[PDB]
Structure 1
Amino acid sequence: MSKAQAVGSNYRVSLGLPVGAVMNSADNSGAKNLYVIAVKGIKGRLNRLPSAGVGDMVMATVKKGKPELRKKVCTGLVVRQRKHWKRKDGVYIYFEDNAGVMCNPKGEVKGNILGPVAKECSDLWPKVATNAGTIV
């Protein structure tokens, strides 16, 4: 799932961390944390984490949030990777700290996206682009 990239996949993979990394929910829904289970499309090989997306969809969970949203897996969307990258451009976007949002399995983000969102992510997921006034 979902899947819709992009055109392209907005080029190479970069992560803040793979499996077992907290990033904030950045969402009006009362998920307060997002912890990764795994990432979609990772086919992977012998001993290698299923590694965080640059703006791609993930199997996640609400570890600390609303108890209703707590437990039960959730497809999400990575929004900003603390750990850095170069783009086809020659810039190195880098962030304060990791972040994403909990989302629908057609990609759609629920409420409104908080804070700054890398443009690649927006490009990937049109709903994301729609539901924010910050796309930097």
Structure 2
Amino acid sequence: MIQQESRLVVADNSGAKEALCIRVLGGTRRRYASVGDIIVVSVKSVIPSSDIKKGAVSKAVIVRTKKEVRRPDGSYIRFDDNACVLLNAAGDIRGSRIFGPVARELRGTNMKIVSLAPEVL
């Protein structure tokens, strides 16, 4: 459950470390974003000598969330942090690596390229 002014961990190898959620996309008065949802973010901190600069506005897709998520098979999954991966203008990954696990929900949302992660759960 991510909303405006939430803070997320950036889970790729682009220089961004943390992001602040500006907007949840996909409708008037849409409050919460879950795994697989597209959001607009602002970059809050970067590692030294990074491609993207601190303060840039980008798009991202949520890959980990602390609030538990229900699957149609009656099971649930939750993580210890809220983490997202940055996207360029076209909608491709800005980076080359993914750190930590990724929800299995990312498969149907045209993020099979994200699904090349250390573990899909």
Question: Equivalent residue of 2:105, what SS?
Answer: helix
Of structures 1 and 2, the one with the larger relative CO (CA 8 A, separation 6+) is: 1
Partner SS for 1:127: coil
Cα distance in 2 between the residues matched to 1:119 and 1:25: 18
Which residue identity does 2:11 align to in structure 1? A
Question: Which of 114, 118, 121 is matched with 1:133 structurally?
Answer: 118
Q: Deviations for 1:57-114, whole angstroms, at most 9, x for unmatched residues?
A: 1101111225742112101010011111211111111111111111123332222111
C-alpha contact (below 8 Å) 1:107/1:127 kept by paired residues: no
CA distance in 1: counterparts of 2:92 and 2:118, whole angstroms: 16
Deviation at 1:18, TM superposition (A): 0.9
What TM-score comes out, normalization by structure 1 length? 0.76
Kindly indicate whether the alpha-carbon contact (under 8 Å) linking 2:35 and 2:61 is maintained by their aligned counterparts in 1.
no
Query: SS of 1:32's equivalent?
Result: strand
Whether 2:69 is the aligned partner of 1:85: answer yes
Is 1:120 paired with 2:105? yes
- Give the share of equivalent positions with the same residue, in percent: 34
Give RMSD over aligned pairs.
Answer: 1.8
Counterpart of 2:45 in structure 1: which amino acid? K
Unaligned runs of at least 5 residues, structure 2: none
Question: Do the aligned partners of 1:76 and 1:103 also contact (CA within 8 Å) in 2?
Answer: yes
Question: Structure 1 regions of 5+ residues with no counterpart?
Answer: 1-14
Distance 2:88 2:31 in 1: 21
Q: How many residues are treated as equivalent by the alignment?
A: 116
- Pick the structure with more strand per residue: 2
- Whether 2:31 is the aligned partner of 1:50: answer yes
Letter in 1 for 2:68: H
Letter in 1 for 2:74: G
The Cα shift of 1:26 comes to 0.9
